[PDB]
Design a protein around this ligand. Structure first.
Ligand code: JKD
Ligand code: MG
Ligand code: ZN
Length: 313
């Protein structure tokens, strides 16, 4: 009832910043999430006993893969927390409620393989979900966890508010399919420039929340250089494993997933920052000015990758 979550002074201060790293102590990650819901949504958005039971079932349904794990879930939720706190008045009570949960749930039961590998392996999930294969599975896993006894954190919502929050979370999670990002951003770019962009148009909010989701999902490129560099090692540990599995099926993997092309990583990051990250945070800064630190940090890390190529590190 009268039970605030607080963090040590360094975390209390640094959690408000976009570049915050949630640290290596796994047991504090749920406290960090609850702290962010309480400050973002209020201490009355969720029954605490249900929230905690939901957090812990979500954690149990993330796998011990090198990158798409529980640490990624909480990292992506913290970046969303940063966006919501810096754009307070632009978002509804339901969006605040829905989006932090969407972020925590957005990679539920990830196996460390691309939609691509599922489809070439002919995994059952590829027959059930022809596109956004894992992303439809992640939403499906969220609904399952919500339907466990004592886990419905949305129990107090109306029949209609419930359906609205589940629809926000579905679109939010689907948008983390980076194949849907390129089209989504180009459309947001055009609408912002021509002046058509209107935040009262529900299908416009959808695109903007979609871009936020991509921004939070890629936020590894917006961290302090040593965090950015070390997260890159984890990201390639998955991709190269998937490459290995591609070769087991008789398929040359793309360079991104070929451990034989280690040497080319720095150049691969350049391409990725220029084709994906920089455009993402550019369009997001334009639409939501207070997100500029993500763009600024992304540019700094690109510049650190340029230095890696030039032998300067
Ligand atoms: C820090 C960081 C974050 C990151 N996120 C992702 C997502 C990958 C992705 N998924 C999709 N889709 C989804 C369905 C179809 C399209 N797309 C479009 N992209 N890659 N990634 C990389 C590797 C970048 C890279 N590294 C090389 N190098 C090749 C040679 C050495 C490494 N390249 C090319 N790119 N580093
Ligand atoms: Mg994902
Ligand atoms: Zn993710």
């Amino acid at each position: 009832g009268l039970m605030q979550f607080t963090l040590p002074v360094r975390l209390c201060k640094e959690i408000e910043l976009f570049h915050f790293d949630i640290g290596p102590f796994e047991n504090m990650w749920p406290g960090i999430f609850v702290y962010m819901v309480h400050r973002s949504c209020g201490t009355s958005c969720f029954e605490l006993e249900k929230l905690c039971r939901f957090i812990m079932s979500v954690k149990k349904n993330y796998r011990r893969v090198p990158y798409h794990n529980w640490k990624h879930a909480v990292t992506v939720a913290h970046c969303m927390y940063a966006i919501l706190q810096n754009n307070h008045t632009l978002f509804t009570d339901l969006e605040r409620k829905g989006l932090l949960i969407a972020c925590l749930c957005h990679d539920l039961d990830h196996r460390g393989f691309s939609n691509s590998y599922l489809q070439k392996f002919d995994h059952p999930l590829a027959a059930l979900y022809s596109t956004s294969t894992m992303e439809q599975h992640h939403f499906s896993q969220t609904v399952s966890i919500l339907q466990l006894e004592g886990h419905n954190i949305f129990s107090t919502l109306s029949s209609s508010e419930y359906e609205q929050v589940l629809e926000i979370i579905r679109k939010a999670i689907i948008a983390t399919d980076l194949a849907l990002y390129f089209g989504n951003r180009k459309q947001l770019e055009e609408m912002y420039q021509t002046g058509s962009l209107n935040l009262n148009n529900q299908s416009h909010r959808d695109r903007v929340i979609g871009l936020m989701m991509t921004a939070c999902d890629l936020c590894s490129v917006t961290k302090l250089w040593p965090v950015t560099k070390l997260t890159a090692n984890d990201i390639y540990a998955e991709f190269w494993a998937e490459g290995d599995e591609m070769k087991k099926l008789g398929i040359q993997p793309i360079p991104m997933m070929d451990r034989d092309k280690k040497d080319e990583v720095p150049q691969g990051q350049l391409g990725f920052y220029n084709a994906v990250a920089i455009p993402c945070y550019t369009t997001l800064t334009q639409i939501l000015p207070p997100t500029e630190p993500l763009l600024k940090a992304c540019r700094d890390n690109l510049s650190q990758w340029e230095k890696v190529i030039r032998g300067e590190e």
